[PDB]
Amino acid sequence: AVGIGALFLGFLGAAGSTMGARS
């Protein structure tokens, strides 16, 4: 059950842009 991988990689394919500002 990989929860954070299924949530962020489904988000990135549906949006089409680099959405992760890791400061």
The gap between the terminal CA atoms of the chain, to the nearest Å, is 28
User: How many angstroms separate the CA atoms of 14 and 8, rounded?
Assistant: 10
User: How many angstroms separate the CA atoms of 22 and 1, rounded?
Assistant: 24
Distances in whole angstroms, Cα of residue 8 to Cα of each of 1, 16: 14, 12
User: How many angstroms separate the CA atoms of 2 and 22, rounded?
Assistant: 21
User: How many angstroms separate the CA atoms of 2 and 12, rounded?
Assistant: 16
- Dihedral class, residue 7 (left if φ above 0, else alpha if ψ from -120 to 50, else beta): alpha
DSSP assignment, residue 14?
H
Say how many residues make up the chain. 23
The sign of the dihedral angle between the CA atoms of 10, 16, 17, 18 is positive
Distances in whole angstroms, Cα of residue 10 to Cα of each of 6, 16, 20, 23: 6, 10, 14, 22
